[PDB]
Design an enzyme around this catalytic site. Structure first.
Site, short mmCIF file in Angstrom:
data_model
loop_
_atom_site.label_atom_id
_atom_site.label_comp_id
_atom_site.label_asym_id
_atom_site.label_seq_id
_atom_site.Cartn_x
_atom_site.Cartn_y
_atom_site.Cartn_z
N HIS A 45 -10.26 19.04 0.39
CA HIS A 45 -11.67 18.97 0.04
C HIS A 45 -12.29 20.36 0.00
O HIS A 45 -13.40 20.50 -0.53
CB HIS A 45 -12.45 17.98 0.91
CG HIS A 45 -12.77 18.42 2.28
ND1 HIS A 45 -12.09 17.85 3.35
CD2 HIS A 45 -13.75 19.20 2.78
CE1 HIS A 45 -12.57 18.33 4.48
NE2 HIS A 45 -13.60 19.17 4.16
N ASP A 89 -5.76 14.65 2.60
CA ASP A 89 -6.67 15.77 2.60
C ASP A 89 -5.94 17.00 3.11
O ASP A 89 -6.15 17.44 4.24
CB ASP A 89 -7.96 15.48 3.39
CG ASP A 89 -9.07 16.48 3.18
OD1 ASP A 89 -8.94 17.35 2.22
OD2 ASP A 89 -10.06 16.41 3.97
N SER A 171 -13.96 22.03 8.43
CA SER A 171 -12.96 21.47 7.55
C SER A 171 -11.83 22.45 7.34
O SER A 171 -12.08 23.65 7.11
CB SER A 171 -13.51 21.19 6.16
OG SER A 171 -14.64 20.41 6.21
C1 LIG Z 1 -16.29 17.77 8.43
C2 LIG Z 1 -17.03 16.79 9.39
C3 LIG Z 1 -18.18 16.11 9.05
C4 LIG Z 1 -18.85 16.29 7.74
N1 LIG Z 1 -19.26 15.14 6.95
C5 LIG Z 1 -20.61 14.94 6.67
O1 LIG Z 1 -21.40 15.71 7.21
C6 LIG Z 1 -21.01 13.89 5.89
C7 LIG Z 1 -22.49 13.64 5.46
O2 LIG Z 1 -22.67 12.59 4.76
O3 LIG Z 1 -23.32 14.60 5.59
C8 LIG Z 1 -20.09 13.05 5.34
N2 LIG Z 1 -18.76 13.23 5.60
C9 LIG Z 1 -17.87 12.34 5.18
C10 LIG Z 1 -16.84 12.66 4.29
C11 LIG Z 1 -15.94 11.62 3.98
C12 LIG Z 1 -16.03 10.34 4.56
C13 LIG Z 1 -17.04 10.05 5.50
C14 LIG Z 1 -17.99 11.07 5.81
N3 LIG Z 1 -16.87 8.75 5.84
C15 LIG Z 1 -17.77 8.00 6.77
C16 LIG Z 1 -15.78 8.22 5.16
O4 LIG Z 1 -15.29 7.08 5.25
N4 LIG Z 1 -15.27 9.21 4.41
C17 LIG Z 1 -14.08 9.18 3.53
C18 LIG Z 1 -18.34 14.24 6.40
O5 LIG Z 1 -17.21 14.43 6.70
C19 LIG Z 1 -18.82 15.20 9.92
C20 LIG Z 1 -18.34 14.92 11.21
C21 LIG Z 1 -17.18 15.63 11.54
C22 LIG Z 1 -16.55 16.48 10.67
C23 LIG Z 1 -15.30 17.10 11.14
F1 LIG Z 1 -15.35 18.48 11.17
F2 LIG Z 1 -15.04 16.61 12.35
F3 LIG Z 1 -14.35 16.70 10.28
#
Ligand SMILES: Cc1c(Cn2c(=O)c(C(=O)O)cn(-c3ccc4c(c3)n(C)c(=O)n4C)c2=O)cccc1C(F)(F)F
Ligand SMILES: *[C@@H]1O[C@H](CO)[C@@H](O[C@@H]2O[C@H](CO)[C@@H](O)[C@H](O)[C@H]2NC(C)=O)[C@H](O)[C@H]1NC(C)=O
Ligand SMILES: *[C@@H]1O[C@H](CO)[C@@H](O[C@@H]2O[C@H](CO)[C@@H](O)[C@H](O)[C@H]2NC(C)=O)[C@H](O)[C@H]1NC(C)=O
Ligand SMILES: [Zn+2]
Length: 215
Positions: A45, A89, A171
């Site tokens: 991503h 990913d 990420s």
């Molecule tokens: C990178 C990240 C994030 C960022 N983030 C958002 O901020 C966000 C939004 O809407 O602002 C959305 N998403 C998202 C991205 C992909 C998602 C998904 C949600 N869900 C719920 C899902 O099923 N998928 C595939 C995100 O990943 C949030 C929490 C933890 C982490 C991590 F560092 F731990 F990985």
């Protein structure tokens, strides 16, 4: 990183700071890690039109002799990567030249650690310094609410009763458990409530080796 602590500068010398360029928006940022002198592992991503990697950083605002800013010649996004589900990913970046090895730059229910320059809170900016947090590896049932989570492909990371978490801008960075890379920061809740979903590196090792041998 939410709920972490600032690292001793250069104490994680495999860490890579990625600046990703797109044709239609400003720069975006990720982490990653140097696995060979000319390869960085990160999240798919984090792909873009072009990427620059900065090795040897601690305070990413203050250029110093440890920095090595390196061009990426080619991005190898996993061919099954799915932009909706974020299955697969994972991505390899080939650097234009091999990095120099220095003290600050080198290759790489249990508790694991993740470092990054990401946001330190839902409404807080990205960190100027590398931060690290210790997170609990959870049973896959803890991530069921992520409807496209798959235990074979991914790790479930972070006790929901703690605020500690990776977040935006983290990420692509590695989750290390006993000093070995086991995960890649992938995704989580917009409100940062743990757990989060990491790519399970072990699943992808044959693909990683395939790319490394062909390039
Ligand atoms: C990178 C990240 C994030 C960022 N983030 C958002 O901020 C966000 C939004 O809407 O602002 C959305 N998403 C998202 C991205 C992909 C998602 C998904 C949600 N869900 C719920 C899902 O099923 N998928 C595939 C995100 O990943 C949030 C929490 C933890 C982490 C991590 F560092 F731990 F990985
Ligand atoms: C990271 O480095 C930057 C640049 O040296 C630091 O930013 C300075 O911080 C002071 C006070 O915090 C400000 O008054 C200066 O204006 C800043 N300078 C610049 C160039 O922006 C920052 O504090 C450092 N962060 C650390 C080490 O945590
Ligand atoms: C990414 O994943 C989604 C979710 O599984 C895929 O969309 C599904 O594709 C199958 C097979 O074509 C269909 O039977 C489902 O109805 C689709 N679901 C949804 C929600 O659209 C999608 O095809 C994948 N994309 C790529 C290019 O890999
Ligand atoms: Zn330094």
């Amino acid at each position: 990183i939410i709920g972490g602590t600032e690292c001793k500068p250069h104490s994680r010398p495999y860490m890579a700071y990625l600046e990703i360029v797109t044709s239609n928006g400003p720069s975006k940022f990720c982490g990653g890690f140097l696995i060979r002198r000319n390869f960085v592992l990160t999240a798919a991503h984090c792909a873009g039109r072009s990427i620059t990697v900065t090795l040897g950083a601690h305070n990413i605002t203050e250029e110093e002799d440890t920095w090595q800013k390196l061009e990426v010649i080619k991005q190898f996004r996993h061919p099954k990567y799915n932009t909706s589900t974020l299955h697969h990913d994972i991505m390899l970046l080939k650097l234009k030249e091999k990095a120099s090895l220095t003290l600050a730059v080198g290759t790489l229910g249990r508790m694991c650690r993740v470092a990054g320059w990401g946001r330190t809170g839902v409404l807080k900016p990205g960190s100027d310094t590398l931060q690290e947090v210790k997170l609990r590896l959870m049973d896959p049932q803890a991530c069921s609410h992520f409807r496209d989570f798959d235990h074979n492909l991914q790790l479930c990371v972070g006790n929901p009763r703690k605020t500690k978490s990776a977040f935006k801008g983290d990420s692509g960075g590695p989750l290390l458990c006993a000093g070995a890379a086991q995960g890649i920061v992938s995704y989580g809740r917009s409100d940062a409530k743990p757990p989060a979903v990491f790519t399970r590196i072990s699943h992808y090792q044959p693909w990683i080796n395939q790319i490394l041998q062909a390039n």
